[PDB]
Amino acid sequence: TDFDSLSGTSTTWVNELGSVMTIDVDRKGGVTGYYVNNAPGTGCRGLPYDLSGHAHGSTIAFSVVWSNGIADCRSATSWAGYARKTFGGGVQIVTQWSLAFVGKAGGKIETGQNVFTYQAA
Amino acid sequence: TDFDSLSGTSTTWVNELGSVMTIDVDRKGGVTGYYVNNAPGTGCRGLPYDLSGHAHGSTIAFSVVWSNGIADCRSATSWAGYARKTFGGGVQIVTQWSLAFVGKAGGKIETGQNVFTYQAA
Numbered sequence: 001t002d003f004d005s006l007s008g009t010s011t012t013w014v015n016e017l018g019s020v021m022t023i024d025v026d027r028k029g030g031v032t033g034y035y036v037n038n039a040p041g042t043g044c045r046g047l048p049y050d051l052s053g054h055a056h057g058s059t060i061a062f063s064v065v066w067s068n069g070i071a072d073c074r075s076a077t078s079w080a081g082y083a084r085k086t087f088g089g090g091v092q093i094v095t096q097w098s099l100a101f102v103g104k105a106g107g108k109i110e111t112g113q114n115v116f117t118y119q120a121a
Numbered sequence: 122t123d124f125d126s127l128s129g130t131s132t133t134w135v136n137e138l139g140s141v142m143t144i145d146v147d148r149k150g151g152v153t154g155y156y157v158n159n160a161p162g163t164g165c166r167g168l169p170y171d172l173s174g175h176a177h178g179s180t181i182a183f184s185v186v187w188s189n190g191i192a193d194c195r196s197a198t199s200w201a202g203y204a205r206k207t208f209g210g211g212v213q214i215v216t217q218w219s220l221a222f223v224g225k226a227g228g229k230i231e232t233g234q235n236v237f238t239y240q241a242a
């Protein structure tokens with residue numbers, strides 16, 4: 001049951017920093033939906049943000065720009081990951097992210113691991 | 122130092138590996154176009170692959186699924202990066218990338234840096 005199995009479904013996922021995204025995969029592989037950041041010590045929290053990417057086979061890549069006309073953290077994030085089933089029936093998306101912002105001293109780029117865990121209705 | 126200044130413009134970018142991308146940035150700051158991989162020791166080379174993400178201000182994040190109806194590397198790369206003016210009034214995109222794939226051993230993710238330089242026609 002790897003990514004093809006989400007052709008035309010909403011699915012919600014949640015990471016270890018509390019951030020929650022709901023992604024809409026279409027038959028052609030295209031990902032869209034909203035990302036809600038709750039990672040401590042960060043901006044643009046508790047508000048949904050347009051994400052967009054593309055899943056195929058066992059891999060998904062997706063991107064959030066942290067601007068939505070409500071709060072603008074002047075920065076963008078992209079995740080790349082692989083779907084992985086968990087002991088008991090569950091599934092995760094293990095990912096690496098990169099985060100580009102620009103401040104006073106010019107541009108910076110943080111990177112980290114993010115493991116998203118399927119949540120059911 | 123602004124992707125906002127790239128609206129309804131198609132623009133070509135190369136990086137230190139010689140990979141090339143043409144990106145189209147709509148009025149809404151949304152991003153589309155082709156990526157051509159040229160990285161030695163990788164798959165899926167010299168063929169265009171769709172890319173998509175969003176640009177706002179001096180930050181962009183975009184994503185490529187490495188399947189295009191020609192060659193399937195069964196992997197997905199996502200970049201996030203800022204715009205950085207160069208001497209001579211040039212513009213470059215500094216970027217951090219994550220490439221996720223399923224190999225014999227299961228599920229790996231590699232990361233790394235990539236600088237893309239604007240090439241006018």
Ligand SMILES: O=C(O)CCCC[C@@H]1SC[C@@H]2NC(=O)N[C@@H]21
Pocket residue numbers: 015017019037038039042043044066073074075076077097099101112114
């Ligand atoms: O600081 C900002 O510019 C706002 C966005 C912060 C989001 C980062 S993306 C990496 C990490 N994982 C999350 O879910 N949130 C933080």
Ligand SMILES: O=C(O)CCCC[C@@H]1SC[C@@H]2NC(=O)N[C@@H]21
Pocket residue numbers: 136138140158159160163164165187194195196197198218220222235
């Ligand atoms: O290896 C694969 O499965 C497909 C090719 C990946 C190309 C990578 S993406 C990261 C780096 N940046 C490039 O311009 N090319 C390589």
